[PDB]
């Protein structure tokens, strides 16, 4: 079965560590950096790891019941009991860090927390504006919960909740790290069942990332969140599950309407792009443009200088 | 080319009317409703119609700049110039309905209102929820604009904005009518260059529909949203674009543990799905099942009753 990439130009693709569409493609220079995000982690032959999921809906998304109001012990309030995504029961002994589609950075993750009454007074609703900090003593997804703080406290405990993300936020002593995995354990825990840290393994060579500037609600940030692989690609090898022939897939990035390839790129076994470059580079590519599927090479391949 | 569906369960799949997961399966008493939703419209041969685009974010979602705080003339004050989804500039001559991605329904769209400056003091922002009627005399998307209220006055003018959609919201006077399509050119204005209506063609045929309880943010609603083709389907057709041999795909539901066909169903060209049934009924279906492309054939083969 012939290994194969989804025709979708850049406007088209959207970003599988954050619910948004793709922005730019951006190669960064080396500096030791550990690079272990657990959203948006997929084999060429359509293996999901780490917490990822299929849905764009899912991911940094919250499923569950609020079950109690801490107030005057925690600022982030209201603490909700998860389940999976989709509706069935956690289970903390599944060999994976966290839920799947659990945030995968150190900040305040920005959105509404919504419910719908189940039992007498069914179908009545409620939503407002809701912070979760992954760094609280609070975030423990891995244990089966997790905590928001609100404006509102027109909350209901014991009523199915829903947190949907929109964005990030910036306050005094909470930056925004993405490369920084939270502890879904919690404090002084370690993770574990993490899909592996990434970096190029050949000379001249650099990461290239799919960016997304998200949303933020205030504070000074460029909102860049950058994935490995875009959720369509991963969601085409889920579907395809074409077997790797090697451990290396070259891509042509391609202009449709002239023929022309404008770079090539190395496409990873384990689910990530290199190219040939030095130095931070946003890269400058027509808006039609898009990868193609060339053929399977090895790690001694080497790559013509972007 | 070979017609198909990919391979997904009712929890992997996307509503294409509004971002939330499917949460079942619905066939419907026919009773002569117009249905003519505009989003998660496409053809089996891989043809976009209506307003449909393909990305799950652009979905009841809209980008451009705040022009003008129009408070005292309108309770939707803030005034949002709209640039199609992908930042390019809207184009009121193309052959569609509103911008791709425009709501399809008669309501209140509830989400949150973000910007991020551009200019002096770049990269600062703010996000504020937000609300979006589809009835107001100041929803004109076809026209270029749409407007919002907000709790928050904490908007700047001409700085580039979002607006992420959450869930809808009911009060009085304001019903919600998920078939009831707004007019995208305002008050005392047609819509032009729809998608056709839908309707099964056929004696004891209903509509089959992909359902999601979708966030409601106050009032009593079971927050239906019901789309036609699941948002996956559709970019799964635009990917593939296979010929369609028929007017009629039969598609046969399957466990994949015990092997067995659970039921049969019309899959049309135009993009629907009918089944022999007389009544409302909520399907009951096993977690794991989905549907199969089988055969093309014609108007004429008769479903085995569901």
């Not at 609600?217 to 599950?241: K, M, N, R, T």
């Amino acid at each position: 079965k012939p290994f194969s990439l989804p025709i979708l130009t850049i406007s088209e693709l959207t970003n599988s560590r954050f619910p948004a569409p793709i922005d730019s493609l951006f190669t960064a220079q080396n500096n030791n950096l550990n690079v272990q995000c657990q959203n948006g982690r997929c084999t060429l032959d359509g293996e999901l790891q780490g917490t990822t999921q299929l849905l764009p809906s899912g991911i940094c998304a919250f499923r569950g019941r609020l079950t109690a109001d801490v107030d005057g012990s925690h600022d982030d309030r209201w603490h909700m009991q998860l389940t999976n995504l989709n509706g069935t029961p956690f289970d903390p002994t599944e060999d994976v860090p966290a839920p799947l589609g659990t945030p995968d950075f150190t900040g305040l993750l920005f959105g509404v927390a919504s419910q719908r009454n189940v039992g007498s007074n069914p179908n009545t609703t409620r939503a407002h504006e809701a912070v979760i900090s992954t760094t609280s003593s609070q975030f423990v997804p891995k244990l089966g919960s997790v905590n928001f703080g609100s404006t509102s406290t027109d909350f209901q405990l014991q009523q199915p909740t829903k947190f949907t993300p929109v964005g990030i936020k910036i306050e005094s002593g909470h930056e925004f790290d993405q490369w920084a995995l939270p502890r879904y354990s919690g404090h002084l825990t370690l993770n574990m069942n993490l899909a592996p840290p990434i970096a190029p393994n050949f000379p001249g060579e650099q990461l290239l990332f799919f960016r997304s500037n998200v949303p933020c609600a205030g504070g000074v940030s460029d909102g860049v969140i950058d994935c490995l692989l875009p959720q369509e690609w991963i969601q085409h090898f889920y579907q395809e599950s074409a077997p790797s022939q090697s451990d290396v897939a070259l891509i042509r990035y391609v202009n449709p309407d002239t023929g022309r390839t404008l770079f090539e790129a190395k496409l990873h076994r384990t689910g990530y792009i290199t190219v040939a470059h030095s130095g931070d580079y946003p890269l400058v590519v027509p808006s039609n443009g898009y990868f193609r599927f060339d053929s399977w090479v090895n790690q001694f391949y080497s790559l013509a200088p972007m």
